[PDB]
Structures are given as C-alpha cells and as structure tokens.
mmCIF file of C-alpha atoms in Angstrom:
data_model
loop_
_atom_site.group_PDB
_atom_site.id
_atom_site.type_symbol
_atom_site.label_atom_id
_atom_site.label_comp_id
_atom_site.label_asym_id
_atom_site.label_seq_id
_atom_site.Cartn_x
_atom_site.Cartn_y
_atom_site.Cartn_z
ATOM 1 C CA UNK A 10 11.055 29.846 1.747
ATOM 2 C CA UNK A 11 14.170 27.868 0.897
ATOM 3 C CA UNK A 12 14.459 26.245 -2.646
ATOM 4 C CA UNK A 13 13.694 22.527 -2.723
ATOM 5 C CA UNK A 14 16.104 20.579 -0.711
ATOM 6 C CA UNK A 15 18.403 18.110 -2.790
ATOM 7 C CA UNK A 16 20.302 15.135 -1.509
ATOM 8 C CA UNK A 17 22.458 12.559 -3.211
ATOM 9 C CA UNK A 18 22.979 8.808 -2.223
ATOM 10 C CA UNK A 19 26.216 7.362 -3.464
ATOM 11 C CA UNK A 20 26.123 3.585 -3.484
ATOM 12 C CA UNK A 21 29.702 3.352 -4.523
ATOM 13 C CA UNK A 22 31.230 4.918 -1.432
ATOM 14 C CA UNK A 23 28.260 4.485 0.913
ATOM 15 C CA UNK A 24 27.582 8.218 1.577
ATOM 16 C CA UNK A 25 24.573 10.382 1.639
ATOM 17 C CA UNK A 26 25.219 14.138 0.918
ATOM 18 C CA UNK A 27 22.390 16.053 2.755
ATOM 19 C CA UNK A 28 20.649 19.201 1.791
ATOM 20 C CA UNK A 29 23.318 21.390 3.129
ATOM 21 C CA UNK A 30 26.223 19.484 1.547
ATOM 22 C CA UNK A 31 27.167 17.580 4.609
ATOM 23 C CA UNK A 32 28.448 14.020 4.019
ATOM 24 C CA UNK A 33 27.199 11.245 6.146
ATOM 25 C CA UNK A 34 28.398 7.771 6.068
ATOM 26 C CA UNK A 35 25.762 5.060 5.460
ATOM 27 C CA UNK A 36 25.591 1.741 7.406
ATOM 28 C CA UNK A 37 23.671 0.252 4.693
ATOM 29 C CA UNK A 38 22.020 0.733 1.182
ATOM 30 C CA UNK A 39 19.779 -1.883 -0.465
ATOM 31 C CA UNK A 40 18.307 -1.497 -3.991
ATOM 32 C CA UNK A 41 14.973 -3.060 -5.217
ATOM 33 C CA UNK A 42 13.511 -2.552 -8.734
ATOM 34 C CA UNK A 43 11.146 -0.179 -7.087
ATOM 35 C CA UNK A 44 13.280 1.785 -4.658
ATOM 36 C CA UNK A 45 16.245 2.380 -2.483
ATOM 37 C CA UNK A 46 16.624 1.613 1.228
ATOM 38 C CA UNK A 47 19.161 3.477 3.466
ATOM 39 C CA UNK A 48 19.983 2.875 7.028
ATOM 40 C CA UNK A 49 22.366 5.272 8.756
ATOM 41 C CA UNK A 50 23.125 6.890 12.061
ATOM 42 C CA UNK A 51 22.182 10.474 12.712
ATOM 43 C CA UNK A 52 23.693 13.319 14.858
ATOM 44 C CA UNK A 53 20.378 15.148 15.177
ATOM 45 C CA UNK A 54 19.254 16.254 18.676
ATOM 46 C CA UNK A 55 15.857 14.267 18.463
ATOM 47 C CA UNK A 56 16.793 11.047 16.753
ATOM 48 C CA UNK A 57 20.060 8.847 16.380
ATOM 49 C CA UNK A 58 19.344 6.599 13.623
ATOM 50 C CA UNK A 59 17.374 6.985 10.293
ATOM 51 C CA UNK A 60 16.066 4.542 7.809
ATOM 52 C CA UNK A 61 14.423 5.827 4.420
ATOM 53 C CA UNK A 62 13.043 4.104 1.358
ATOM 54 C CA UNK A 63 13.157 6.279 -1.792
ATOM 55 C CA UNK A 64 10.202 5.175 -4.110
ATOM 56 C CA UNK A 65 10.889 6.929 -7.506
ATOM 57 C CA UNK A 66 7.639 5.744 -9.213
ATOM 58 C CA UNK A 67 5.506 7.183 -6.645
ATOM 59 C CA UNK A 68 7.429 10.329 -5.817
ATOM 60 C CA UNK A 69 7.591 9.452 -2.071
ATOM 61 C CA UNK A 70 10.385 9.041 0.363
ATOM 62 C CA UNK A 71 9.302 7.158 3.617
ATOM 63 C CA UNK A 72 11.404 7.433 6.764
ATOM 64 C CA UNK A 73 11.394 6.154 10.332
ATOM 65 C CA UNK A 74 13.265 8.370 12.870
ATOM 66 C CA UNK A 75 14.789 6.364 15.722
ATOM 67 C CA UNK A 76 14.064 8.901 18.438
ATOM 68 C CA UNK A 77 16.047 9.375 21.593
ATOM 69 C CA UNK A 78 14.302 8.236 24.825
ATOM 70 C CA UNK A 79 11.391 10.497 25.881
ATOM 71 C CA UNK A 80 11.355 11.956 22.386
ATOM 72 C CA UNK A 81 9.215 9.693 20.405
ATOM 73 C CA UNK A 82 6.942 11.381 17.877
ATOM 74 C CA UNK A 83 3.465 10.336 17.408
ATOM 75 C CA UNK A 84 3.830 8.864 13.922
ATOM 76 C CA UNK A 85 4.452 5.404 12.503
ATOM 77 C CA UNK A 86 5.692 6.668 9.209
ATOM 78 C CA UNK A 87 6.760 9.996 7.741
ATOM 79 C CA UNK A 88 6.699 10.615 3.948
ATOM 80 C CA UNK A 89 8.275 13.517 1.971
ATOM 81 C CA UNK A 90 6.821 14.315 -1.456
ATOM 82 C CA UNK A 91 9.109 15.230 -4.394
ATOM 83 C CA UNK A 92 11.068 13.684 -7.230
ATOM 84 C CA UNK A 93 13.271 10.596 -6.260
ATOM 85 C CA UNK A 94 15.520 9.498 -9.036
ATOM 86 C CA UNK A 95 17.300 6.120 -9.606
ATOM 87 C CA UNK A 96 21.003 5.887 -10.726
ATOM 88 C CA UNK A 97 22.934 2.862 -11.289
ATOM 89 C CA UNK A 98 25.301 4.178 -8.779
ATOM 90 C CA UNK A 99 24.003 7.590 -7.411
ATOM 91 C CA UNK A 100 20.375 8.185 -6.467
ATOM 92 C CA UNK A 101 18.898 11.647 -5.931
ATOM 93 C CA UNK A 102 16.237 13.263 -3.874
ATOM 94 C CA UNK A 103 14.441 16.640 -4.444
ATOM 95 C CA UNK A 104 11.951 17.606 -1.804
ATOM 96 C CA UNK A 105 8.761 19.399 -2.880
ATOM 97 C CA UNK A 106 7.746 20.624 0.553
ATOM 98 C CA UNK A 107 4.659 18.601 1.235
ATOM 99 C CA UNK A 108 4.914 15.607 3.678
ATOM 100 C CA UNK A 109 2.618 13.086 5.173
ATOM 101 C CA UNK A 110 2.401 11.828 8.850
ATOM 102 C CA UNK A 111 0.781 8.330 8.999
ATOM 103 C CA UNK A 112 -0.448 6.879 12.236
ATOM 104 C CA UNK A 113 -1.104 3.259 11.212
ATOM 105 C CA UNK A 114 -4.768 2.162 11.304
ATOM 106 C CA UNK A 115 -5.737 5.686 12.268
ATOM 107 C CA UNK A 116 -5.101 8.563 9.938
ATOM 108 C CA UNK A 117 -2.822 10.526 7.624
ATOM 109 C CA UNK A 118 -2.082 14.195 7.850
ATOM 110 C CA UNK A 119 -0.783 16.343 4.891
ATOM 111 C CA UNK A 120 1.666 19.016 6.177
ATOM 112 C CA UNK A 121 3.546 21.984 4.735
ATOM 113 C CA UNK A 122 0.917 22.892 1.953
ATOM 114 C CA UNK A 123 1.682 26.597 3.031
ATOM 115 C CA UNK A 124 5.347 26.105 2.136
ATOM 116 C CA UNK A 125 4.498 24.479 -1.169
ATOM 117 C CA UNK A 126 2.211 27.656 -1.970
ATOM 118 C CA UNK A 127 4.884 30.122 -1.100
ATOM 119 C CA UNK A 128 7.560 28.224 -3.110
ATOM 120 C CA UNK A 129 5.250 28.446 -6.040
ATOM 121 C CA UNK A 130 4.380 32.070 -5.748
ATOM 122 C CA UNK A 131 7.975 33.024 -5.489
ATOM 123 C CA UNK A 132 9.021 30.879 -8.443
ATOM 124 C CA UNK A 133 11.137 28.320 -6.611
ATOM 125 C CA UNK A 134 9.374 25.657 -8.494
ATOM 126 C CA UNK A 135 7.114 25.701 -11.521
ATOM 127 C CA UNK A 136 3.329 25.116 -11.744
ATOM 128 C CA UNK A 137 3.687 21.609 -13.301
ATOM 129 C CA UNK A 138 5.951 20.524 -10.394
ATOM 130 C CA UNK A 139 3.763 22.051 -7.768
ATOM 131 C CA UNK A 140 0.614 20.336 -9.369
ATOM 132 C CA UNK A 141 2.449 17.076 -9.368
ATOM 133 C CA UNK A 142 3.495 17.365 -5.764
ATOM 134 C CA UNK A 143 -0.233 17.876 -4.908
ATOM 135 C CA UNK A 144 -1.210 14.762 -7.104
ATOM 136 C CA UNK A 145 1.658 12.497 -5.636
ATOM 137 C CA UNK A 146 0.362 13.459 -2.253
ATOM 138 C CA UNK A 147 -3.384 12.654 -3.055
ATOM 139 C CA UNK A 148 -2.475 9.364 -4.734
ATOM 140 C CA UNK A 149 -0.731 8.379 -1.652
ATOM 141 C CA UNK A 150 -3.318 9.742 0.716
ATOM 142 C CA UNK A 151 -5.954 7.624 -1.232
ATOM 143 C CA UNK A 152 -3.919 4.241 -1.377
ATOM 144 C CA UNK A 153 -3.088 4.652 2.374
ATOM 145 C CA UNK A 154 -6.673 5.238 3.432
ATOM 146 C CA UNK A 155 -7.860 2.421 1.175
ATOM 147 C CA UNK A 156 -5.552 -0.070 3.085
ATOM 148 C CA UNK A 157 -6.475 0.793 6.683
ATOM 149 C CA UNK A 158 -4.369 3.842 6.902
ATOM 150 C CA UNK A 159 -1.290 1.412 6.622
ATOM 151 C CA UNK A 160 1.442 2.777 4.274
ATOM 152 C CA UNK A 161 3.264 -0.663 4.200
ATOM 153 C CA UNK A 162 0.114 -2.559 3.220
ATOM 154 C CA UNK A 163 -0.795 0.027 0.471
ATOM 155 C CA UNK A 164 2.742 -0.396 -0.825
ATOM 156 C CA UNK A 165 2.673 -4.235 -0.561
ATOM 157 C CA UNK A 166 -0.592 -4.214 -2.561
ATOM 158 C CA UNK A 167 0.899 -2.452 -5.495
ATOM 159 C CA UNK A 168 4.062 -4.745 -5.467
ATOM 160 C CA UNK A 169 6.330 -2.194 -3.836
ATOM 161 C CA UNK A 170 6.695 -3.842 -0.546
ATOM 162 C CA UNK A 171 9.038 -2.011 1.844
ATOM 163 C CA UNK A 172 10.672 -3.394 5.016
ATOM 164 C CA UNK A 173 12.195 -1.931 8.047
ATOM 165 C CA UNK A 174 14.806 -3.032 10.726
ATOM 166 C CA UNK A 175 12.030 -2.757 13.308
ATOM 167 C CA UNK B 11 -11.682 33.701 -13.777
ATOM 168 C CA UNK B 12 -12.225 35.029 -10.106
ATOM 169 C CA UNK B 13 -13.945 32.460 -7.742
ATOM 170 C CA UNK B 14 -17.485 31.443 -8.990
ATOM 171 C CA UNK B 15 -20.211 32.756 -6.468
ATOM 172 C CA UNK B 16 -23.771 31.438 -6.350
ATOM 173 C CA UNK B 17 -26.750 31.919 -4.339
ATOM 174 C CA UNK B 18 -29.459 29.630 -3.103
ATOM 175 C CA UNK B 19 -32.507 31.600 -2.441
ATOM 176 C CA UNK B 20 -34.756 29.530 -0.310
ATOM 177 C CA UNK B 21 -37.580 32.175 -0.329
ATOM 178 C CA UNK B 22 -37.555 32.734 -4.046
ATOM 179 C CA UNK B 23 -36.816 29.068 -4.858
ATOM 180 C CA UNK B 24 -34.099 30.299 -7.137
ATOM 181 C CA UNK B 25 -30.480 29.453 -7.610
ATOM 182 C CA UNK B 26 -28.569 32.369 -8.903
ATOM 183 C CA UNK B 27 -25.717 30.922 -10.822
ATOM 184 C CA UNK B 28 -22.192 32.149 -11.113
ATOM 185 C CA UNK B 29 -23.387 34.463 -13.993
ATOM 186 C CA UNK B 30 -26.449 35.912 -12.104
ATOM 187 C CA UNK B 31 -28.683 33.633 -14.074
ATOM 188 C CA UNK B 32 -31.751 32.720 -11.894
ATOM 189 C CA UNK B 33 -32.758 29.110 -12.334
ATOM 190 C CA UNK B 34 -35.858 28.114 -10.783
ATOM 191 C CA UNK B 35 -35.567 25.445 -8.136
ATOM 192 C CA UNK B 36 -38.105 22.506 -7.533
ATOM 193 C CA UNK B 37 -36.961 21.651 -4.164
ATOM 194 C CA UNK B 38 -34.692 22.836 -1.412
ATOM 195 C CA UNK B 39 -34.277 20.880 1.836
ATOM 196 C CA UNK B 40 -32.202 22.252 4.771
ATOM 197 C CA UNK B 41 -30.463 19.900 7.239
ATOM 198 C CA UNK B 42 -28.055 20.972 10.066
ATOM 199 C CA UNK B 43 -25.136 19.675 8.024
ATOM 200 C CA UNK B 44 -26.201 20.916 4.595
ATOM 201 C CA UNK B 45 -28.539 22.043 1.907
ATOM 202 C CA UNK B 46 -30.105 19.823 -0.715
ATOM 203 C CA UNK B 47 -31.297 21.259 -4.071
ATOM 204 C CA UNK B 48 -33.066 19.608 -7.011
ATOM 205 C CA UNK B 49 -33.573 21.627 -10.078
ATOM 206 C CA UNK B 50 -33.926 21.468 -13.912
ATOM 207 C CA UNK B 51 -31.115 22.310 -16.297
ATOM 208 C CA UNK B 52 -30.669 23.455 -19.911
ATOM 209 C CA UNK B 53 -27.216 21.757 -20.143
ATOM 210 C CA UNK B 54 -26.367 19.945 -23.367
ATOM 211 C CA UNK B 55 -25.825 16.693 -21.505
ATOM 212 C CA UNK B 56 -28.416 16.648 -18.710
ATOM 213 C CA UNK B 57 -31.792 18.146 -17.965
ATOM 214 C CA UNK B 58 -31.943 17.754 -14.157
ATOM 215 C CA UNK B 59 -29.568 17.889 -11.125
ATOM 216 C CA UNK B 60 -29.445 17.222 -7.529
ATOM 217 C CA UNK B 61 -26.794 18.742 -5.241
ATOM 218 C CA UNK B 62 -25.802 18.886 -1.646
ATOM 219 C CA UNK B 63 -23.901 21.779 -0.168
ATOM 220 C CA UNK B 64 -21.911 20.619 2.916
ATOM 221 C CA UNK B 65 -20.723 23.788 4.581
ATOM 222 C CA UNK B 66 -18.557 22.170 7.403
ATOM 223 C CA UNK B 67 -16.634 20.091 4.877
ATOM 224 C CA UNK B 68 -16.243 22.737 2.226
ATOM 225 C CA UNK B 69 -17.891 20.435 -0.356
ATOM 226 C CA UNK B 70 -20.619 20.390 -2.848
ATOM 227 C CA UNK B 71 -21.779 17.028 -4.155
ATOM 228 C CA UNK B 72 -23.895 16.723 -7.335
ATOM 229 C CA UNK B 73 -25.497 14.023 -9.547
ATOM 230 C CA UNK B 74 -26.817 14.549 -13.024
ATOM 231 C CA UNK B 75 -29.940 13.132 -14.914
ATOM 232 C CA UNK B 76 -28.650 12.799 -18.285
ATOM 233 C CA UNK B 77 -30.493 13.204 -21.758
ATOM 234 C CA UNK B 78 -31.362 9.724 -23.264
ATOM 235 C CA UNK B 79 -28.573 9.670 -25.904
ATOM 236 C CA UNK B 80 -25.930 11.329 -23.457
ATOM 237 C CA UNK B 81 -26.088 8.728 -20.399
ATOM 238 C CA UNK B 82 -23.261 7.978 -18.224
ATOM 239 C CA UNK B 83 -22.775 6.451 -14.724
ATOM 240 C CA UNK B 84 -24.153 8.195 -11.720
ATOM 241 C CA UNK B 85 -20.874 9.466 -10.784
ATOM 242 C CA UNK B 86 -20.564 12.065 -7.945
ATOM 243 C CA UNK B 87 -19.032 15.375 -8.864
ATOM 244 C CA UNK B 88 -17.645 17.282 -5.990
ATOM 245 C CA UNK B 89 -16.837 21.038 -6.014
ATOM 246 C CA UNK B 90 -14.523 22.444 -3.350
ATOM 247 C CA UNK B 91 -15.138 25.810 -1.953
ATOM 248 C CA UNK B 92 -16.767 27.862 0.885
ATOM 249 C CA UNK B 93 -20.457 27.225 1.507
ATOM 250 C CA UNK B 94 -22.093 29.800 3.710
ATOM 251 C CA UNK B 95 -25.424 29.138 5.509
ATOM 252 C CA UNK B 96 -28.163 31.793 5.694
ATOM 253 C CA UNK B 97 -31.547 31.922 7.118
ATOM 254 C CA UNK B 98 -33.071 32.817 3.664
ATOM 255 C CA UNK B 99 -30.097 32.504 1.300
ATOM 256 C CA UNK B 100 -27.197 30.261 1.267
ATOM 257 C CA UNK B 101 -24.001 31.242 -0.862
ATOM 258 C CA UNK B 102 -21.098 29.422 -2.447
ATOM 259 C CA UNK B 103 -17.639 30.559 -3.369
ATOM 260 C CA UNK B 104 -15.866 28.049 -5.665
ATOM 261 C CA UNK B 105 -12.213 27.276 -5.044
ATOM 262 C CA UNK B 106 -11.386 25.654 -8.402
ATOM 263 C CA UNK B 107 -10.556 22.008 -7.201
ATOM 264 C CA UNK B 108 -13.078 19.270 -7.902
ATOM 265 C CA UNK B 109 -13.439 15.560 -7.649
ATOM 266 C CA UNK B 110 -15.093 12.879 -9.638
ATOM 267 C CA UNK B 111 -16.026 9.780 -7.642
ATOM 268 C CA UNK B 112 -16.670 6.605 -9.643
ATOM 269 C CA UNK B 113 -18.349 4.763 -6.877
ATOM 270 C CA UNK B 114 -16.684 1.621 -5.678
ATOM 271 C CA UNK B 115 -13.647 2.312 -8.097
ATOM 272 C CA UNK B 116 -11.794 5.658 -7.708
ATOM 273 C CA UNK B 117 -11.640 9.349 -7.060
ATOM 274 C CA UNK B 118 -9.857 11.774 -9.499
ATOM 275 C CA UNK B 119 -8.738 15.404 -8.320
ATOM 276 C CA UNK B 120 -9.248 17.957 -11.020
ATOM 277 C CA UNK B 121 -8.289 21.556 -11.676
ATOM 278 C CA UNK B 122 -5.254 21.820 -9.365
ATOM 279 C CA UNK B 123 -3.606 23.868 -12.096
ATOM 280 C CA UNK B 124 -6.496 26.404 -11.900
ATOM 281 C CA UNK B 125 -6.116 26.674 -8.137
ATOM 282 C CA UNK B 126 -2.327 27.294 -8.631
ATOM 283 C CA UNK B 127 -3.004 30.019 -11.327
ATOM 284 C CA UNK B 128 -5.582 31.579 -9.067
ATOM 285 C CA UNK B 129 -3.200 31.692 -6.147
ATOM 286 C CA UNK B 130 -0.262 32.996 -7.924
ATOM 287 C CA UNK B 131 -2.250 35.825 -9.550
ATOM 288 C CA UNK B 132 -3.840 36.898 -6.313
ATOM 289 C CA UNK B 133 -7.458 35.792 -6.831
ATOM 290 C CA UNK B 134 -7.224 34.050 -3.547
ATOM 291 C CA UNK B 135 -4.746 33.976 -0.637
ATOM 292 C CA UNK B 136 -2.576 31.168 0.648
ATOM 293 C CA UNK B 137 -4.826 30.419 3.677
ATOM 294 C CA UNK B 138 -7.786 29.770 1.269
ATOM 295 C CA UNK B 139 -5.737 27.796 -1.252
ATOM 296 C CA UNK B 140 -4.420 25.827 1.624
ATOM 297 C CA UNK B 141 -8.096 25.264 3.002
ATOM 298 C CA UNK B 142 -9.102 24.152 -0.578
ATOM 299 C CA UNK B 143 -6.375 21.542 -0.594
ATOM 300 C CA UNK B 144 -7.015 20.306 2.924
ATOM 301 C CA UNK B 145 -10.836 19.955 2.097
ATOM 302 C CA UNK B 146 -9.969 18.040 -0.993
ATOM 303 C CA UNK B 147 -7.591 15.620 0.761
ATOM 304 C CA UNK B 148 -9.870 15.103 3.797
ATOM 305 C CA UNK B 149 -12.659 14.100 1.253
ATOM 306 C CA UNK B 150 -10.279 11.854 -0.685
ATOM 307 C CA UNK B 151 -9.088 10.170 2.375
ATOM 308 C CA UNK B 152 -12.592 9.517 3.607
ATOM 309 C CA UNK B 153 -14.012 8.500 0.386
ATOM 310 C CA UNK B 154 -11.018 5.955 -0.021
ATOM 311 C CA UNK B 155 -11.501 4.564 3.362
ATOM 312 C CA UNK B 156 -15.097 3.657 2.743
ATOM 313 C CA UNK B 157 -14.635 1.686 -0.553
ATOM 314 C CA UNK B 158 -14.540 4.823 -2.636
ATOM 315 C CA UNK B 159 -18.021 5.535 -1.701
ATOM 316 C CA UNK B 160 -18.919 9.307 -0.922
ATOM 317 C CA UNK B 161 -22.365 8.452 0.641
ATOM 318 C CA UNK B 162 -20.865 5.911 2.930
ATOM 319 C CA UNK B 163 -18.209 8.237 4.226
ATOM 320 C CA UNK B 164 -20.575 11.143 4.660
ATOM 321 C CA UNK B 165 -23.155 8.785 6.506
ATOM 322 C CA UNK B 166 -20.275 7.512 8.755
ATOM 323 C CA UNK B 167 -19.479 10.977 9.931
ATOM 324 C CA UNK B 168 -23.140 11.887 10.744
ATOM 325 C CA UNK B 169 -23.728 13.797 7.501
ATOM 326 C CA UNK B 170 -25.889 11.387 5.378
ATOM 327 C CA UNK B 171 -26.696 12.582 2.093
ATOM 328 C CA UNK B 172 -29.810 11.053 0.100
ATOM 329 C CA UNK B 173 -30.883 11.546 -3.409
ATOM 330 C CA UNK B 174 -34.449 11.282 -4.763
ATOM 331 C CA UNK B 175 -34.139 8.174 -7.068
#
C-alpha cells in the first residue's frame, strides 16, 4: 500500500519526526545499551499519551497507548516489526508492516501480514527484508509464548528489560 | 516449483507423492483431527517414516527412522499447507513453509524465501500466503508455550498425536 513508514528520534532537541514529517516534542528520551525509550503527548483522537521502546537488536518497537476514557483497546502491548537503528544522537525507525498485539498471560496476535505481502509484490521492500520481517515476528512470538505470553518477561529474560510509566 | 500435491489413498494403501510416485503404505489410521501414516522410504538418510496430517491446523508432522550410520535426534519436521479430508483419499497441498522442532529446545521456521517467491510469481494468492504464515505462527506459539514440545501442545488442544515406538 504505502511504502514503509520512517520516523526519526532526535535526542539533541527532544523531537520525534513522524511518518508524515510532523514534528512532535518529546517529554522524555532514555537510552539503554539495548534500546531507546520515548514518552510524549499525542494529539490522536483515540489516545493522549504515547510510550515506546525501540529495540534494535530484535527489530521490534513496543508501545503503550494511553487511551482516552471509554476508548481502551484490548491489548497490554503493541509491537511494530521493522528495522530500528541506534544513533549517538538520532535514532531511526522503519516499519515493515507486521505488528503484534499482546494480551499478557493470554495470547499474541500477528496483524497486517496482508500488507507485508502486498508491499512485497509491488516492490516497496525486497524479499530479504520481507523474509526478515517474518523472522523477527516469529522470534518474538516464540519468546513471548515461552514466557507466559508476557512481552516484558521475555525481554527481561534476555537482558533487555523494559519499563513503563505505568 | 508450484505447490506440491500428494494423495493418501486409504483404499489402495498408497501415498502418491508429489511426483505421482506411488509408495506403498503399511498403516493408515483416521482420527477426527487427522490422518496417521506409517510407511517405508527409499531416502538416502532414512528407511521409514511416520506422519500425521492435521487439516484443522494446516500442519503435517513427521518423524524419520534413520539408517544406522545416518542417525539424528527424533526432531519433528512440520510442513505447512492445506490438508483435505476424503472418505477414501486425503490430499495435501504444500505451502512451502516448514518447521523443525528440537523437542524441549527450539523451533526453526524455514523456507520463508520460497513462500515469498511463490507469492510474487503468482503460484499462490495473498490469502493463501497469509494463511500459511498464520498456520506457522499459530504452531510456533503453541509449541513455545508448551516447553517447545509439539506433542504436548497438540494434546493440550485435543488433537493428541502418538507415534508407534
């Protein structure tokens, strides 16, 4: 459909440029050897606050959406699959269509496989990248499932503990 | 190659392989959740094999009985595809992806590249490619949640498999 969404995360001026080039100010960035945490406001009609962890070595970006009242979605964690790249001052995300919805202690659901398929057939990403997207997803699905369908527990078990403001 | 098709002829006690080779079958057993087959092989590595076709999961699970100088662990080899029941003849259509389960250790997903090249060249549609991926992830999730043990996952969902031993 659309080519892969790309965002940048500038630690120097505390901004996040979104996939449409829109610049958002960030409340807070925190770097660990294994990832980048971002906490910022959102002007989205469904949610008013966003936290994310970019996990370069796993090809994952986990997010929590702080939904408006009466708008809570039935997920504990949302995970985009792609390439997430460290920079000493600017980090980068490229979204490869797939995403996971995790309900802690219950299940994980892989979404948007159809989009990956159509991006691949129309040449918006190559076969290596599409294959890698599927493998990044399955690695995560496997680790999550092996740890009580708990994303945080899987991550902590491999020394990439993530934490949230909630 | 176009998706591999096989037949499992319960009345002839044949499996007709993807080439149209008829291989004699020693035993077929039908269950509501699947078909068990035990048969000889002329493969360079193994001389016997057992499989279960699981139509409702889109999986076929196999183990091999290796030649004496060719022995490996009994890992489970899982092919992903569409498995069709019949009164007299079941059939499989292979959708390229496959898993190797090393029981109690891990699961490896193979041949994703083959699926990608079949989809892009029109040998199967997006719906079917999508179905193959979702069969594979459903299985990886269930296996991982049961100590990387295919049999334990399958038993837990009411589709127990059993081998001869």
